[PDB]
Structures are given as C-alpha cells and as structure tokens.
Homo-oligomer: 296 residues x 4
C-alpha cells in the first residue's frame, strides 16, 4: 500500500509577470486554472489529477520557488510526521487551513539545502474533468497545449545534500533510487528519491547556493507526446534548454524549457519501476554527461 | 512510502505440456528463464525485474493457476499480515523457505473466491541484466521475443468477490480503483484493486466456478510495443483472443492471447495513476 | 520523377442524411469542409493536403460511391490518357470544368467492374492552412477530430478484376504491388495497385455485384494516431468493423469503421515503399 | 507513375579504416553486407530494400563521398537521360557493367558543386530475406542494430548550387520541395529536391569547398525507432552531432551522428508528401536554426 508521504502535492513558484505567466502555464503548458485568491496567486493543476491544484504562481520581485509540498495519507499521518520532524530536531511551522485556496493546514519546515518543504493531508478533490461513470480515456483537455498528466517532481539545488537525504530517507519514508557519485572520495553529488514506486518524486543536486530551483517536472504519456511538447514550445517561441532526449539517470525521456520569467520546467515520461526493496543505481562523476543526456 | 503488500511477486500456472510451455515463454513472450527445481517446475522473470522469479509453470493434467503471490516490505510485515489474516477469520498455511527456488517462506491462504494467495518478503535479487553502475536503459534482452517488463497483475474469476474485496481492502491494504456494476442489482460484478499507485495489482470478476484464472498480465513499454507483440504472436501462430486495443476500464491498451496449454495472458501498457485517497471509477453493467 | 497519374484525387460518396453526414465527416473524421454547391454536395479535404477537395458527399437513396478520380500531371497528360483509354477500347465521357466546385474538366469512364473512374489535371490549390514561409509541422487542424493527412486510396469490389488490372497497368501507368491468389483456379481474387511508390493507390477484390465500394481510406501520421482515432470513434458512438490492427497484405496498421450512412472508411498508417521495378508480393487464398 | 529517375541507388563513402567501418555499419547502423569485390570495397544495403546495394565503403586516406548514384526506370530511360545531360552541356562518362558488384552500366558526370553523380538502371535484386508469398511484416533483421529501412537521401555541400538545381530540375526531372532563402539579394542557400513524392531524395547547401558531403541519410519506421537509434549510438560510443529532434524543413525527425571515420549520417523519419504540382515552401535565412531544429 501507499502510506505516509504519497506524492508531490504542489509547487509555489514566482514569476516576474503574472499575466504572461497565466497565459503561458494555461495556454502553452496546458495546465487547468483552478482559482485565484485575494493574495493575487493563481492556482493550476494537470487535467488528469483530481486535487484542486499542484502548481501556483505569484508575481514576485524575482523568479524561483517559494515552497514545495507533499500530500500525505491522512491527518493522522500528518501529525505523525510533524512530530517525527521535531523529534529529529527540525523546527516546523503549522500553516492554517484556508491560507491556500481549497487547502487544509500544512506542516512547513526548512531543509539544510535552504528549500522550504510542505506536508498536507487535505485539499479539495475537483476531479479530472471526466465523468465518474463510464469515463473516457481522455478529453479535449489532453489536447489543450502540452497538457501534462501530473506534477511528477522537482529538482532542487542547495548545500548539504547528505543531510537532506537523511531527513528524506530516515524521516519522510523516502529511499534512494539513483545517485551521481562525485569525483573519487565518494559522497553523493546528486540524489533521486522516491516515496512510492516511481523513479523519483524529488531530487537534489549539491550546490553552494541554497533555495535554488533547477526545475519542476510534468509527466507526459508517451515519446510522441514529448515531440509534440517540443513543437508546441517552438510555435510559442519558448526557449528550450535541452531538446527532446533521454536521461541515463532514470531512463526518462525529456525536454528542458524555460518559462517567461526564466523558471525552468520539464516535460518527461518513462523510467523503470523501483520499489523500497531495491538497491540504488550509481553513476560515476566522469560519466555524468551520459547520465544527463544519454544518446549524446 | 510503499509499505505493506508491495507488488505481485509470482504466479504459478499449470501447463499440459512443460516442453512446449518452456518453448513459448522463452521465445514468444520472451521471459528470462532463471531455474528449474526437482519437481520439474521452470522459473521465469521479466528482464527488467530484479527478483529471481515472477512466473512459474508446472506440468499438470489441467491448465489454470495454482497460486498467486505478492511480495511484502519485510519479515515483520509478513508476520503482521499473517496474524491479521487469522484475526480476520482466515486459515493460514506456512510454506517453508526453499520450497520454491531462491524464495523465502510464504504465507498462503484461500480466498472465498477459491483462489490461493501468497505473501512473502524474501526472494533473491538477481538483477536486470544491466550493471548497477552507469546502467544503460536496456540491452538485447529487451528485444528477445515480446520481452515484457514486469508481471503487472492477474484477473481471477471467483464466486464471493464481495468478501474477497473485504479481505484485500480491510486486511491487505489494497483499495478500489474501478468496478463494474451489476444489472442495476448493484453489487460489483467485477473489481480492480491496487496496493500502490498502479491502476491495479489484481482484479476479480464474479463467477460461479471458483479458482478460475482469466489471465496473468505483463507490462509493455508503449503502444508500439503492443503492436510488435501482436506481430510476434502472428509469426508464432499464437492464438489471439482479442487483437490490440484499448480497455475503457484501466485505460490500458492490451492484447489477450493464449499460451499453448490454453492459459490466457495479457501484454499491455498505459493506465492512469490512482492513489489511496482517490475515489473509484464505476462502469454500468450495460456499458461493459 | 512522378508522372502520368499522380494520386487519388477525390472520391464522391453517397450519404442518406446530408446534415448528419457533414457532422460526422467534419467532427469525427476531422476533414475540412471547403464548399457546398448548387446540387447540394459538400466538399472536404484532409487538412494537410493542398488541393480544394478529396472527398465529396451527396445525399442519395442508397449509400456507396458515385466515382473515384485521380489527378494527373498536367493537361497534356490528361489529353493523352483519354486518347489511350479510347484506343484501348473504352468509352470516355468528358465532364466540363466547374461541374464540380473548383475543379477542371474530367475524363470519366466505367471499368468492367462497374465502378466509375475519373482523370483530371486541374484542381484549385487552397493550401494546408499553414504559411508557405517558415512553415510549422502542423497546427490546430491536426487535432480537430481524427484529422487524417490524405485520401490514401479505396478498395473496390467488382467482377472482372483481371480486366481492371490490365487497364490500370497497361493504360494508366500503374503496377501490381500485392495480390491474393484464388483458391487454386489461380487467378487473382484481389489486387493492390500503385501509380507511385506507395503500397497502393487503389485496390480491387473480385465480387459478383458491380460498383460495390468496400471503403475509402485515409492516412494517419503514426500508430499512436491510430489508437487516438480509435478513442474518438468510441466517444462518438461510431460503429467499428475491425478495430486497431495490422493488415499484413500491405504491412500497415488500421481501423475499419462505418459512416452513419453505412459507408466504411479506413484510418491507417505504415506500409513499405515499392517502386515500379519491384515484383509483386502474393498471398494464398486460405492465408488471406 | 514513377518514371525517369526513381530513387537514391547508392553512396560510396571513404573510411579511414575498413575494419572499423565494417563492424560499425553492419553492427551499429545495422546495414546488411551483401558482398565484397577484389578492389577492396564492401557492399551494404538496408534490410528492407530489394536491390543488392545502397551503401559502399572503401578504405582511403580521407573521409568523404566518392559518388552518389540514382536508379532509373529502365535502359531506354538511362540512354535518354545521358543524351539530355550531354545536350545540356555536361560531359559524360560510361562505366561498364560489373565495375561494381552486381551492378549494370552507369552514367557518371560532375556537378558545378564538385560532386560526382551517377545514374543506372540495372542492379541485381536480392530481396529482403522475407518470403514473396504470405510475407511477414519483418524478421530478426529489423532488430539488428539501428536497422534502417532505406537510403533516403544525402545532403551535399558545394558552390554553384543554383546551377546544380537547374540540372536536377530541367534535366533529371526533380522538383524543388523546400528551400532556404539567402539574405536580401534573393538566391537559395539551401535546396531540397525530390524526384518522387518524398519530401526529398537529395539536397544541396551553398558552401566554398567543392565535393563536400554533409551526410547520407537512412529512413526509420517511427519516432520511437529514432529514440532507440539514439540509445544504440550511446551504447556503442558513437559520437552524436544533433540529438533526437525534429527539423523545421521537411518536418522530418532526425539524429545526426558520426561514423568512426568522421562521415556524418542521419537516421531519419516522417515528413509530408509533396507532389510535382506543389509549390515549394521557403525558409528565411534568419530562421535557419528553426529550419534545422524546429523545437530548439
Ligand atoms: C538527471 C535527471 C534525471 C531525471 C530528471 O527528471 C531530471 O530532472 C534530471
Ligand atoms: C476488463 C479489464 C480491464 C483492464 C484489464 O487490465 C483487464 O485485464 C480486464
Ligand atoms: C486487403 C487490403 C490490404 C491493405 C489495405 O489497406 C486494404 O484496404 C485492403
Ligand atoms: Fe526532472
Ligand atoms: Fe488484465
Ligand atoms: Fe484500405
Ligand atoms: Fe539527410
């Protein structure tokens, strides 16, 4: 069964221009807008998810990520984890229910890497736009812009990855799926963690600066959907970082692009199916180009 | 976190001709053979899996499924589940480690539907043919026969699916992803259960005769892999039940075919990503 | 170089309910409507084609095909073909330009199988909805309903297929790509002809009733588009003959579905690339 | 009907080492070796083609293309074209049958770009290994290495491209499918020519040096087959030039990779279906990069 931390729940990202951020994430990336609160934040979700939101933008003085949240099994689990975080020595903040639209109270804490993490058990279920009886495989939503299927994960850049790993694997019930070994005198330079049987729900890369956001990732259905994402990116003159290709790490096909404010995002699909009983895979530092781009 | 029952671990199926069975599963389905025991059973595993076996075939006078096993997180979980099964009212039998090659002891029990289910926490990890360091996405094994990636599930036909549902959801930690209503006599005629975030790890359909096996299912990479599987079946004179298509339930695109002995198996891919907190989808009997 | 007869130009089919015919062809199949004439006919084209029409519907009492036309290289070629058709022993009737919206004059004749074939060299070019400068690979149109790429061919049922083959290969510059042997009398019960390097531009099957239309066929981009077309059909309660699958007698995937009036159409993709110098492939009747 | 020049027939390429070439083309690219003559040349063909050869390699002190040939309808056609070429003002050479294994006589001539072109009508038909009766869609060969379907075309770099276009369109029966406009003072920097309904059977790009080969291209079945080709290249340490991506021109998906000797080749697929009555599409020079890489 899936217990404890279930999946990435939402990513709060700030854009320089809200208006063009709204247009981009709704008409280009194909996210479904789901509400706009009094703080000027607009909520989005993938057409296929069931919960109210998974991506929220806020016009800030700068770009980047405010926080990244994870939905847990239930309120009992939430309390349970908050307690384990404090027993571990981390200071937690309990954000009240309602602060975020259609969202319940959440437990927020800061990692050694500088990134703020959130844990919540409640968030209104709006459905995926498809009937609950005799549902079709998809609908027009699937063809609106790129239209990804779910917030798959995000990759953060910050210092002390080892400590971050410990909290995730010893406290949040995560486990190492893959790692990038730094130059001889081993220590993990990059770490891919899962709290399920997905290749990863979140990843971290050793970096001197803290609170850095490499990218938030969105799941696609097939390799042909990755191509189409690429075409859509070009049609909208979206700056692409790395064209359509495969990562060795996770074997996940992907494309890196930038949003109007410079926030990098990813549209990918594929990868194997690790379970908690599996041993992590490792990549040598010198061979990290292949782990990043596999064909190339 | 994935805890409790983790995933389908193995299916032991009966074949009327062991020789032809080994031939078909090794060449057509393209499963990797990993061993043969003294009883004459042959062990196979999908190439991308890491454990020693997931599909075992045993010659017999009748086709069908002997039992279906799920792997659990650890020994402590296995012991706990055994007690919950008994506390629930089910009789549990303990299979000694070693009885099945490279497999620890198992907790076996019989469902109201007639099928035998097993739980285990230990089974030797043999890997996926690829190195653990700087691993490649795939190798030649991926193109040997259909070459499915994992045993995905099975569909079992049994009489008391209502009580079966109770056991899987109330004892084993599974949950309802989808169901098929009964002629406005609204009872579930068919249920799809998941113990993870997969569309389903096992499924049952209401049926008068107990112990019936509808099919064991193997996962493929993509829709094009489904087509290739269809081509390979044809080159091998494989009897196909229903050509390549899409199931509304599960949304998975599959192909039903029969093995030489008459056992039906499935090669599919796709499906959404449900989670424990999701409500099940329903299908009207008439729209089945 | 491509010369003589170039490709299937248009197929005019009979629909029992004009309005519902327009709705199916423009919403489900996703063809682009290009005009309506004084006779009540509605014109469509595939989004990616460049000419004004490739598929015309006309309300009638019976479903079926009125005629199938091919576009030829130029006016000179058209004149030459007409003369050669006559010298061969066929009678030709010249239809004036404009008789069909945006269409030049046409050379029409009846095959021994009863079907009416037309040849023309003039058809207004309207574009594929994409700029001619810095053109994108596609646009919204490829996601409007099925959205096929081109009128690929048709399959006609008629008696006297052997004589039909002669006319096409000896007069129209076509060549045999594949054939289906007769039971053992050994003649051809079916033929797939090409006037390019496509697997087939038109095909025929020996059948008692003359002028029978089996289906018109539309080309798709990839195997996934075929799956998609399958889903759109189900969504629209479309009657499907045979679902997504591989042909074999042409090495291309496909779906046979029905028009609301009962006209079968095909959405497929794939196929190898034959050339005039290749020998035809053959199929035994039983294997067919 | 297809008449005149039917399609690309063969490319003879120079490799710096015949051994590394034979292991690479037969095992990595997945071509099928059909013969070897006493002159030290090894013949290859795609598994699905029917003729004896489409790709020939010869060991020399420099990489590059010796010549590119096209197959014509028949003998009469070959004579007609020879006469037309000479009547056009080009001198022609006749290579007797047999000079090349399993090949008939051919007409050779030089273009203003400095490339040697050949025309032939006779070449032994070996088949695709599959039966001619109740043939399967494919066999084990299509899973041998990349295993392309056909020699699709080649891209040649030279000068006097305008003169080259005139020869192919006014003499060899080809037509302009797409072109790349050169900065104001209209002329074409790039040209894609077809002698059938393929997006292109050959192309030329304006360049100083003469006789320069950009690459020979091989057709693949699908987008996923392109991804697989990239995976196989990585697996074989093959240096990749341009990762899996779409074009702009021709809509064709592709991957540019280098052989051991430095010769560039392409694994290609897709594209529309132009016909002789179609007007060519154009790409402005400034947009050339979208020309080569639509998505990025
Ligand atoms: C190296 C890598 C692998 C998989 C990802 O999703 C990603 O963002 C980075
Ligand atoms: C009815 C049904 C739906 C999905 C499946 O995977 C299956 O085996 C049966
Ligand atoms: C017999 C046959 C083979 C291929 C086709 O595309 C078709 O319509 C019919
Ligand atoms: Fe990522
Ligand atoms: Fe199944
Ligand atoms: Fe057809
Ligand atoms: Fe090329």
């Amino acid at each position: 069964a899936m217990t404890g931390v279930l999946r990435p729940g939402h990513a709060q990202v700030r854009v320089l221009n809200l208006e063009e951020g709204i247009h981009f994430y709704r008409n280009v990336l194909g996210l479904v807008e789901t509400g706009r609160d009094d703080q000027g934040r607009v909520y989005f979700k993938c057409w296929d998810e069931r919960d109210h939101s998974c991506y929220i933008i806020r016009e800030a003085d700068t770009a980047g990520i405010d926080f990244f949240g994870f939905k847990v099994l239930d309120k009992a689990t939430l309390e349970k984890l908050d307690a384990d975080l404090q027993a571990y020595g981390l200071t937690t903040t309990r954000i009240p229910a309602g602060e975020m639209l259609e969202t319940g109270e959440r437990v927020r804490f800061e990692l050694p890497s500088g990134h703020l993490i959130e844990l919540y058990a409640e968030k209104t279920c709006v459905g995926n736009g498809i009937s609950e009886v005799n549902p079709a495989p998809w609908n027009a939503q699937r063809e609106h812009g790129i239209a990804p299927i779910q917030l798959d994960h995000c990759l953060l850049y910050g210092p002390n990855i080892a400590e971050v790993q410990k909290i995730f694997t010893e406290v949040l019930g995560f486990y190492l799926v893959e790692r990038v070994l730094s130059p001889d005198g081993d220590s993990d330079m990059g770490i891919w963690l899962s709290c399920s049987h997905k290749v990863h729900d979140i990843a971290f890369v050793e970096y001197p600066e803290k609170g850095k956001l490499h990218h938030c990732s969105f799941l696609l259905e097939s390799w042909e959907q990755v191509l189409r994402a690429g075409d859509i990116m070009s049609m909208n003159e979206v700056n692409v970082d790395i064209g359509p290709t495969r990562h060795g790490v996770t074997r996940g096909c992907t494309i890196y692009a930038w949003d109007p404010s410079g926030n990098r995002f990813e549209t990918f699909m594929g990868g194997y199916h690790p379970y908690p009983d599996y041993e992590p895979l490792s990549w040598t530092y010198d061979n990290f180009a292949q782990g990043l781009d596999y064909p190339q």
